Amino acid sequence: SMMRWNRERRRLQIEDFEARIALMPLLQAEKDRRVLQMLRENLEEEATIMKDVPGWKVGESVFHTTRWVTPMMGELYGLRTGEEILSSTYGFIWYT
Amino acid sequence: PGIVELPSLEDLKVQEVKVSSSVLKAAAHHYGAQCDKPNKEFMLCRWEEKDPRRCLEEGKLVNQCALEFFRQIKRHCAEPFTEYWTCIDYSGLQLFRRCRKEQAQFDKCVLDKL
Amino acid sequence: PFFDVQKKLGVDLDHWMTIQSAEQPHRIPARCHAFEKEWIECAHGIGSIRAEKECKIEFEDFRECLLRQKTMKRLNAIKRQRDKLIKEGKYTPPPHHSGQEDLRP
Amino acid sequence: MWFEVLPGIAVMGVCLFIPGMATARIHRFSNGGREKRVAHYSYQWYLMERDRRVSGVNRYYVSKGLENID
Amino acid sequence: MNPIILIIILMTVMLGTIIVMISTHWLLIWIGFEMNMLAIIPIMMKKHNPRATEASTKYFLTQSTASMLLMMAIIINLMFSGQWTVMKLFNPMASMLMTMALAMKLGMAPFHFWVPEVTQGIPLSSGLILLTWQKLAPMSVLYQILPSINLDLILTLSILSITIGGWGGLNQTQLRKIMAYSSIAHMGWMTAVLLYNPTMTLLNLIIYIIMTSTMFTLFMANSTTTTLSLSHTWNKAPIMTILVLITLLSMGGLPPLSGFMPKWMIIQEMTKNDSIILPTLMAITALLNLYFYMRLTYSTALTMFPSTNNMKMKWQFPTTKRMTLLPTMTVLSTMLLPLTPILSILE
Amino acid sequence: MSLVYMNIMMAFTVSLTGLLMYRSHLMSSLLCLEGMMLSLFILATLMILNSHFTLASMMPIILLVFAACEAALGLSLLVMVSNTYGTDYVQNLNLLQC
Amino acid sequence: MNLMITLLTNFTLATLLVTIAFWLPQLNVYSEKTSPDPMGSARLPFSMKFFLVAITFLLFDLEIALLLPLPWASQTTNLNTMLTMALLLIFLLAVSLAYEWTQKGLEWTE
Amino acid sequence: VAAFLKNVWAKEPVLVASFAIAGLAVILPTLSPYTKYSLMINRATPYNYPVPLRDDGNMPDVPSHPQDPQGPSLEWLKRL
Amino acid sequence: MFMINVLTLIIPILLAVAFLTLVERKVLGYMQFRKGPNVVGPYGLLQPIADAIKLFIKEPLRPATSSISMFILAPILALTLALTMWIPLPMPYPLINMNLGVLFMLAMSSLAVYSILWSGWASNSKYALIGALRAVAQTISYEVTLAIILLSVLLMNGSFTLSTLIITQEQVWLIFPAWPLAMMWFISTLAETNRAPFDLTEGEFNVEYAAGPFALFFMAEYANIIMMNIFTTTLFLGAFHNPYMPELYTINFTIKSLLLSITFLWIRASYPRFRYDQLMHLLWKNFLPLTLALCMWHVSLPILLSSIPPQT
Amino acid sequence: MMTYIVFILSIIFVMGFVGFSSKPSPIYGGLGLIVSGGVGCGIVLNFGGSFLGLMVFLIYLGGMMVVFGYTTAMATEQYNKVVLGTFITGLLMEFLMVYYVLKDKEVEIVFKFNGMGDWVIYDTGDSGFFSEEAMGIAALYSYGTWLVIVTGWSLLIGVVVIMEITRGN
Numbered sequence A: 001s002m003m004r005w006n007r008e009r010r011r012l013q014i015e016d017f018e019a020r021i022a023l024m025p026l027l028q029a030e031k032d033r034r035v036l037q038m039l040r041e042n043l044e045e046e047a048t049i050m051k052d053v054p055g056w057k058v059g060e061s062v063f064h065t066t067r068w069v070t071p072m073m074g075e076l077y078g079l080r081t082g083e084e085i086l087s088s089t090y091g092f093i094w095y096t
Numbered sequence B: 001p002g003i004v005e006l007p008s009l010e011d012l013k014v015q016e017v018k019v020s021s022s023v024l025k026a027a028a029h030h031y032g033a034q035c036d037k038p039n040k041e042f043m044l045c046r047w048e049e050k051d052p053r054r055c056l057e058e059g060k061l062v063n064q065c066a067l068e069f070f071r072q073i074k075r076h077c078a079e080p081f082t083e084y085w086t087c088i089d090y091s092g093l094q095l096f097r098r099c100r101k102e103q104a105q106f107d108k109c110v111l112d113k114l
Numbered sequence C: 001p002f003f004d005v006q007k008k009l010g011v012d013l014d015h016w017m018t019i020q021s022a023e024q025p026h027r028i029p030a031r032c033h034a035f036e037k038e039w040i041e042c043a044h045g046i047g048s049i050r051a052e053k054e055c056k057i058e059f060e061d062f063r064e065c066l067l068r069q070k071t072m073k074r075l076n077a078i079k080r081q082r083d084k085l086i087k088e089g090k091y092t093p094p095p096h097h098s099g100q101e102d103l104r105p
Numbered sequence D: 001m002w003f004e005v006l007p008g009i010a011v012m013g014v015c016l017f018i019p020g021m022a023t024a025r026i027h028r029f030s031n032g033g034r035e036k037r038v039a040h041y042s043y044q045w046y047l048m049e050r051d052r053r054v055s056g057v058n059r060y061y062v063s064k065g066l067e068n069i070d
Numbered sequence E: 001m002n003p004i005i006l007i008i009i010l011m012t013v014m015l016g017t018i019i020v021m022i023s024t025h026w027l028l029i030w031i032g033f034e035m036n037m038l039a040i041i042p043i044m045m046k047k048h049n050p051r052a053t054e055a056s057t058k059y060f061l062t063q064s065t066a067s068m069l070l071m072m073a074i075i076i077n078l079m080f081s082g083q084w085t086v087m088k089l090f091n092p093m094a095s096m097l098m099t100m101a102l103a104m105k106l107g108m109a110p111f112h113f114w115v116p117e118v119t120q121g122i123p124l125s126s127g128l129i130l131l132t133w134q135k136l137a138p139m140s141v142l143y144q145i146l147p148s149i150n151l152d153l154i155l156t157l158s159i160l161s162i163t164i165g166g167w168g169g170l171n172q173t174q175l176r177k178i179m180a181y182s183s184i185a186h187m188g189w190m191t192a193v194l195l196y197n198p199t200m201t202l203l204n205l206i207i208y209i210i211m212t213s214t215m216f217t218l219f220m221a222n223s224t225t226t227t228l229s230l231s232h233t234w235n236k237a238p239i240m241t242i243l244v245l246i247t248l249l250s251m252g253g254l255p256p257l258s259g260f261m262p263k264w265m266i267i268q269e270m271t272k273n274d275s276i277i278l279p280t281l282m283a284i285t286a287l288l289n290l291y292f293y294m295r296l297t298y299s300t301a302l303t304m305f306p307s308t309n310n311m312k313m314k315w316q317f318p319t320t321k322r323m324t325l326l327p328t329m330t331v332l333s334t335m336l337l338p339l340t341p342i343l344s345i346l347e
Numbered sequence F: 001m002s003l004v005y006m007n008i009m010m011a012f013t014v015s016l017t018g019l020l021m022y023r024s025h026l027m028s029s030l031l032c033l034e035g036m037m038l039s040l041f042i043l044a045t046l047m048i049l050n051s052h053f054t055l056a057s058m059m060p061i062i063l064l065v066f067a068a069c070e071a072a073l074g075l076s077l078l079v080m081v082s083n084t085y086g087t088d089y090v091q092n093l094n095l096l097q098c
Numbered sequence G: 001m002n003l004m005i006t007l008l009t010n011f012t013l014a015t016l017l018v019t020i021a022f023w024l025p026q027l028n029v030y031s032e033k034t035s036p037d038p039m040g041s042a043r044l045p046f047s048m049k050f051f052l053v054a055i056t057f058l059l060f061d062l063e064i065a066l067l068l069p070l071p072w073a074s075q076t077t078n079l080n081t082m083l084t085m086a087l088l089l090i091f092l093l094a095v096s097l098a099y100e101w102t103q104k105g106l107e108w109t110e
Numbered sequence H: 001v002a003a004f005l006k007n008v009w010a011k012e013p014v015l016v017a018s019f020a021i022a023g024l025a026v027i028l029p030t031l032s033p034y035t036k037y038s039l040m041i042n043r044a045t046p047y048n049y050p051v052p053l054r055d056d057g058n059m060p061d062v063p064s065h066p067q068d069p070q071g072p073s074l075e076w077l078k079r080l
Numbered sequence I: 001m002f003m004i005n006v007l008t009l010i011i012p013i014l015l016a017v018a019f020l021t022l023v024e025r026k027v028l029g030y031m032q033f034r035k036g037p038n039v040v041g042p043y044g045l046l047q048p049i050a051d052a053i054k055l056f057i058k059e060p061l062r063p064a065t066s067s068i069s070m071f072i073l074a075p076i077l078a079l080t081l082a083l084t085m086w087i088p089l090p091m092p093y094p095l096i097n098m099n100l101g102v103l104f105m106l107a108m109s110s111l112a113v114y115s116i117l118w119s120g121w122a123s124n125s126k127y128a129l130i131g132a133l134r135a136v137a138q139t140i141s142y143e144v145t146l147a148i149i150l151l152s153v154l155l156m157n158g159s160f161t162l163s164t165l166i167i168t169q170e171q172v173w174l175i176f177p178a179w180p181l182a183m184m185w186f187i188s189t190l191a192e193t194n195r196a197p198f199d200l201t202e203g204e205f206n207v208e209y210a211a212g213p214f215a216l217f218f219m220a221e222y223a224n225i226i227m228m229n230i231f232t233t234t235l236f237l238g239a240f241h242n243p244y245m246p247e248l249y250t251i252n253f254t255i256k257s258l259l260l261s262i263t264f265l266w267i268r269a270s271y272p273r274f275r276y277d278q279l280m281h282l283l284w285k286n287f288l289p290l291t292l293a294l295c296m297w298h299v300s301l302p303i304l305l306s307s308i309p310p311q312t
Numbered sequence J: 001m002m003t004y005i006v007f008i009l010s011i012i013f014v015m016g017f018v019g020f021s022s023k024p025s026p027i028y029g030g031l032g033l034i035v036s037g038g039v040g041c042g043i044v045l046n047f048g049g050s051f052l053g054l055m056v057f058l059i060y061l062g063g064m065m066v067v068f069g070y071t072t073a074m075a076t077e078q079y080n081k082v083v084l085g086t087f088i089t090g091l092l093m094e095f096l097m098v099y100y101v102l103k104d105k106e107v108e109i110v111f112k113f114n115g116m117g118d119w120v121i122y123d124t125g126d127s128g129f130f131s132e133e134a135m136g137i138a139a140l141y142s143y144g145t146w147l148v149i150v151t152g153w154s155l156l157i158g159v160v161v162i163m164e165i166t167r168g169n
């Protein structure tokens, strides 16, 4: 009985994983536009904040290489409210 | 070092697929069969360029090809689809195995009309 | 004494856990996979004495990926200037940095 | 006789029936007449937070179907 | 102890040291030290008296503290390098902590304070293991981390070990403490030439292990643990007095013997690096070690101390002890200086 | 670097100086030693979970097990001390001064 | 967050019940009790066997800690190696138990 | 081998059942025909994304669409 | 709203523990050819209320405690761990749905021996300390087979998720592939809670506590008894779950857990006590070798049958 | 306040070590190390290490500190200025560190440390249908062969060594 039912459960797992795989291109495109939205917002607010500070380059990469670096949590949700911060940074860990 | 170059906010504007995760998972296998080509163009671009800023326009094609997937559901089979993603939507883990007759009606209606 | 028994006998006793750029289960990348791959491919074969001065850029990139000290220092500067301009009333946050804009996807 | 132990077993069984029935009705009431979303994995949390953003009412459980696309 | 269990425990000691020698990951280095300590604890408590239990307690505390500082150095290396290769260390704090941890494992001064205690508390065979085999694994890690070892730290540990192990044995009448302070002085000699030429470190380690194994094997053959009991040897076994004579004249670095070989080569690799004060002070401080070696040879070989009457009984029983490799080690620890350029096999 | 690493390192040094300054007991010494091991567990764990280096997630478990076995060894050593003097006092362990 | 609230609620209920148990019958003004055991005043004799069963627990619990990732380890692609190492860990736990047996370690608490 | 086995089953049946169950657990995966299917199911479970290949011009066995005939098939998993 | 759910968990736990004492005295009465309590309430239903009011106004026993702090903390820890063992229990939905509820319960039950140990040392009696050391050694002994049997059963589940353990048993009860693990599990959980025939605390540690705190230890012990019966029910006798009607699962697992708690009550009125070495012999020389052998069998068995359960 | 919660737990963690590094009594030392293990477990849980934190409960606290309190309760027969002085010393050192790093957003005792909350250093992606920590621990049997061999051999030798050194013969 456990043989038949765990084989059926493996087939159902593969079906759910292929549903996920069929959804991953759209979720990847939305994720890319999401993080580029947030970085552009942080960039424009840095340009309108860091005007007084002498010698500041707005949007300057701390890395030497010009390769894309995955944005850190503080890079994206830095200038936002603490509610959005906590929802993004401990939401899944604290969820039930 | 140098200045990172981000795209403008006009470059990120696109008609968002504003449907829920159960609507996505219920329509998932037909989305993976029918919206194959620009999705795989996009994900090949995404693993080869390793930079999302170089992958935006292809992603727009994804966000173009997804919506034509759903309008073509909405023009022909909105009612069995709605009955199917409601039953998918009830479950906490969103089981396919709880929802086989609604899947059967939706697959029958899509195989007939589309 | 480094009796390299693993390279002599061709066995892989502990090289897999050595670096983050190695073969991970289910192809999970580390958060600094590209930086460590670039530092290793720079510093390979040339020795440590040459590698400390000829791969300094890749190693500074990889260390600053790991610890994020320049990133957090930049965030400290941005947030502290923002707090000073809030305290002086010279600046207001936008609506999209207050939670009233119905986020993207 | 032996059915004299049954009032105490009935009281104890109602007292064990209360927590599961109560958490089931609370999970239906707090989640729009449905089950609580099990997010054990970060993909499930990604979808659930995407639901929270696409509903527009800051709630994951308020679902949006074909009426939300044109 | 069950001899099968003794064989398995000694193979586990050797296994932990080999796991330190052959591994490229830091966790396996730490695992080799943990396995080595965990297996050597019953070798110290073999005879089951409170001195062995006290010695095992002191050894456990020092080696546990060193293992914790080692794992902290490894964790800081993973902080500042993101990886686990047993190679140079990418932080001077992790380099300092690992050099401290290995100095505590070797018993280098001022972490020497457990070596004359524990060697006194344990039998001669377990002290032989502690002073010969237990020096192999930390010197292997010091061999592999030397591009990041701070110079002033390792030289301070080296001269402090040489001076304190020199002034230790002058007050000692117990032979195991004499071998312990000799161990501290020779480990200072090994780590002083470390950053200049680690081949001479390996040469000093091999010659020291040969000479120490010769002296402990003579001590086990004659069943003597004090100077005054070693002085009874001429009336029982007159050849053993000649053997402890030539081996203790070897351990002081007197030419034409082989124990002159390492320290001379150490000076030969330190005057190349324009250090003249430091090998001179080290060589002059080694005269203290040679002085208490000469004290032991005066008590044993060059004079005849009075024995007792019961020694006449022991004239009628030959030595049934398995004096393993004692002619081989006695020859190698004395007559090897004409083969001084053999050291290139350690390169 | 990150701010929690400050507290985990300072906890390691607090338990270090507790393990490096005995009062009377050997059990309190072993408690400080296992506090050092616990802080190493937390610190290695926060690094490995930080950097998403997947294969080292089995690393702190190993760091637990060996060292917990090490603790067992020390406890047995303490018991042998307490099978001689009646207490686990470190001032009774001075037979090897001469 | 729900879990931290639940733990705080359970600790608060337990502390409230313990406070009621330690302070409600203190208000009884009953009587002062004048001059409030098989061994009289002898010291506690150390039992070697209790310490032995505790350390045997600790070591076998460490072997359990090695065994705990097995429901996740059955999902691997290198199943021959996984099966060999799983049977080797349970076999080394059994060898630890057999050595604990045959050298009279499980005695008078068998 | 026969009287000894009945003797240890008479005196210590818990240990006989222990060594019998452990011996079956050792030897029986090497003799089972279904051990291969465990491997084939665990490698067919798609945890990651099947990152597609650039069609250079000569890949006759790689499909262009998931519903194409060429490629890996799991009809053995459905049927068994 | 979640606080209401926590209250509707923890208050009915206390009520079911209160009336489990009545069910114990009644079931032990009728199994002993007599009656249980039937005078104080109608069919005895007011006996636990009368007894709780009796104990909370009895004189405090007023001991000379070695440590005041641990004398306070041992009932606090016992009650807190007795209540937090319920929050991952799926019935059919837990209060705290977590990915590692099984391992959470094994951890919070491993922490339960500190209450016994602190109550034993916080009393000035050396006899109470010897009894506490015996009870702690007994409990940590049987936690070994708890962990290994539980691991061997969860090799058919795929995860440490307790909610997945209902999905695992939708075609068969898991006692049918794992009844030897079930019977050793059942006796081992009988030996966890110091329950007869493993109750050497009643055969000739918290005897210095007053009637209030001793009642709190007693109710924490019966909360552990009800909880381990519910956990054994979910673990081996998994009920049918219809997601649109969860009360079917709730009525079903409640009936099974009541039968299993009555089975504890039915064991304690049937057997004499073990001697201390006899249950040590039962663990280390009977349960643990079969537990290791069945652990090897349940490692190698989903591989040889191609029945490896899903990870998710 | 809630964005600093791991930091706050870590402060309790440091306080917990001063709860036993001052060494009041080995039973109060055991209690302090239990509370320290609980809060350090919570720190592990808040980066997503659920299995490692439950190892801190099941093996460190419920496995090993049980044995420490057990062995300690078989000694120190049941019934300071330096203890309380060292305790308040370590507490004031730690709160001076807190005050410095919260008024400067930067501190340097031995290393440089940021003063913002440690939520900033996290990752912004998902791991799919697996915990990366759970799969890296599951990798102990496929990729971790030599590690399992040496760990199981060290535990077997640990059983043998404990039986040798406690026999007295």
Ligand SMILES: CCCCCCCCCCCCCCCCCC(=O)OC[C@H](COP(=O)([O-])OCC[N+](C)(C)C)OC(=O)CCCCCCCCCCCCCCCCC
Pocket: H011, H012, H013, H014, H016, H017, H020, H021, I175, I180, I182, I183, I184, I186, I187, I197, I232, I236, I267, I271, I282, I285, I286, I287, I290
């Ligand atoms: C979950 C629902 C409930 C589950 C069932 C439990 C309900 C029944 C409870 C009854 C009351 C129990 C009161 C406490 C009793 C404690 C004493 C006791 O029973 O000790 C256990 C006794 C102890 O042994 P003993 O003391 O009776 O015997 C003497 C033992 N020596 C010689 C060592 C002194 O037995 C066991 O340990 C058995 C444990 C379970 C065995 C499971 C075996 C399954 C079959 C395997 C295969 C066999 C065939 C061979 C291979 C074939 C391959 C194809």
Ligand SMILES: CCCCCCCCCCCCCCCCCC(=O)OC[C@H](COP(=O)(O)OCCN)OC(=O)CCCCCCCCCCCCCCCCC
Pocket: C001, E010, E123, E125, E126, E128, E129, E132, E133, E136, E202, E205, E206, E209, E210, E213, E217, E220, E322, E323, E324, E325, E329
């Ligand atoms: C770059 C370097 C890499 C590494 C190179 C190699 C390093 C070698 C290190 C050698 C360390 C030797 C440690 C001691 C030997 C190990 C086995 C042992 O314990 O032997 C002692 C044993 C105990 O017998 P027991 O019953 O306890 O006796 C008590 C008295 N009744 O039996 C006895 O007591 C019998 C008495 C005689 C024993 C003599 C043993 C001599 C062993 C050393 C030989 C020399 C080293 C090898 C050659 C040089 C290599 C550098």
Ligand SMILES: CCCCCCCCCCCCCCCCCC(=O)OC[C@H](COP(=O)(O)OCCN)OC(=O)CCCCCCCCCCCCCCCCC
Pocket: G091, G094, G095, G097, G098, G101, G102, H008, H012, H015, H016, H017, H018, H019, H020, H021, H022, H023, H024, H026, I288, I289, I290, I292, I293
């Ligand atoms: C190879 C397979 C895997 C093997 C390793 C895994 C084992 C899993 C189970 C764990 C066992 C751990 C404990 C083992 C202890 C063995 C030693 C032992 O118990 O010897 C004593 C015993 C007699 O008991 P006694 O000492 O008198 O006890 C006092 C109470 N009367 O003596 C005996 O009862 C005799 C015991 C030895 C003979 C047992 C034979 C069983 C054969 C079953 C059928 C074949 C199964 C295939 C494997 C055979 C392996 C030999």
Ligand SMILES: CCCCCCCCCCCCCCCCCC(=O)OC[C@H](COP(=O)(O)OCCN)OC(=O)CCCCCCCCCCCCCCCCC
Pocket: D011, D014, D015, I015, I041, I042, I045, I046, I049
């Ligand atoms: C989830 C469900 C949990 C259920 C838990 C409880 C189960 C049992 C429920 C109670 C069952 C009935 C109990 C009846 C008790 C006896 C009452 C009685 O007859 O008392 C008589 C007494 C004297 O009255 P008197 O006027 O003198 O009579 C002379 C007549 N010529 O007068 C008095 O004593 C005064 C009146 C006292 C009334 C007390 C009633 C019992 C209260 C128990 C607490 C629980 C309440 C129910 C909770 C669940 C339902 C909401």
Ligand SMILES: CCCCCCCCCCCCCCCCCC(=O)OC[C@H](COP(=O)(O)OCCN)OC(=O)CCCCCCCCCCCCCCCCC
Pocket: A092, A093, A094, A095, A096, D039, D040, D041, G001, G003, G004, G007, G011, I073, I076, I077, I080, I081, I084, I097, I098, I099, I100, I101, I104, I111, J034, J035, J037, J038, J039, J041, J042, J043, J045, J046, J050, J053, J054
């Ligand atoms: C002597 C002092 C007083 C003694 C009495 C009171 C203390 C003892 C009794 C209480 C013990 C408390 C145990 C707290 C942690 C338990 C482990 C845990 O949280 O596991 C559950 C869960 C892991 O499951 P998972 O599904 O992976 O997480 C959700 C994401 N998917 O993980 C989560 O859901 C993580 C949620 C966020 C992090 C929660 C952190 C809680 C606070 C820190 C620990 C609190 C206890 C400290 C003292 C312990 C003393 C033993």
Ligand SMILES: CCCCCCCCCCC1=C(C)C(=O)C(OC)=C(OC)C1=O
Pocket: I014, I018, I021, I022, I047, I048, I051, I052, I055, I214, I215, I216, I218, I219
């Ligand atoms: C306020 C909530 C209830 C508090 C606890 C008191 C009631 C439950 C325990 C009382 C008890 C009962 C009924 C009981 O029957 C009994 O004997 C077996 C005890 O002593 C061992 C008890 O302690």
